[PDB]
Design a protein around this nucleic acid. Sequence first.
DNA 1: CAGTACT
DNA 2: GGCAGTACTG
Length: 282
Amino acid sequence: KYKVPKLKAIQELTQVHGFGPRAAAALFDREGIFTVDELLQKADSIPSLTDQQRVGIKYFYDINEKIPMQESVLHENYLREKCMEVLGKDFSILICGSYRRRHPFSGDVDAILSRTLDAPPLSEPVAATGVLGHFVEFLESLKYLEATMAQGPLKYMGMGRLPPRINTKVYKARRVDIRLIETKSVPTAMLTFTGSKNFNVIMRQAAISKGYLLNEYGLFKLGTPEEARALYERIGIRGKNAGEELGVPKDELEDKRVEVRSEQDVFDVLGMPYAKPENRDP
DNA sequence: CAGTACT
DNA sequence: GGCAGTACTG
Ligand code: NA
């Protein structure tokens, strides 16, 4: 990632959702598959593919159809309406991603679900109440969500299709991600999930250089690299994260939180000039 | 875990 | 020698 026959096949096959270099090489080696179209053709007869991979394959065409800005507006409205219906006024939905950066086309619908600033406090992480699952099930019963790639208490990834509009128009299925985020974490999650990816990396490096940890959950003042390392020793998890569980920082990391109300707060604390979403494509 | 995904 | 950071799958 830093530097950035069998190789060319890997380059082909990793276009498919669920397939990385490892699954690709196994397709090549075990199955003798060189191209996407061979994989599409053989998929059903390779018993070892995951359910998620089978979704990536079955929806290959849809996934690679870009979403026009105007359809994203409809997805946003729809998600907000359904959120209001089944979750009520305590909850809100915001669509981020390249759409919020105002690109004419996007590759998916990237949503944040969170409690409003006015909602009563909870005594538990919001992801422990099972609200993401309730919301997902609601959207499935409506046939908006029609296939799941992966779902946990914090994050849903799947396929969503707007219902037909009346001549009648049938919509394409679209990649939909939904993340359940604590209220105080909204501005940092908006930053993260609006991106771009390179933008986030640059800002996280700026945070590191000033002795902060920046992630979607918050901005945390760590101090020296050694104080940071000492902290990571205590609560940091090798292949997982710096110390959150169910979207809530562990106490010792929470103690380091610098509260923010807005994206602007984060730029300011890091000594960076504000950039509007549409100017976050470095 | 190791793979894969996401911004 | 470490790098941006974190979620779900099996
Ligand atoms: Na892929």
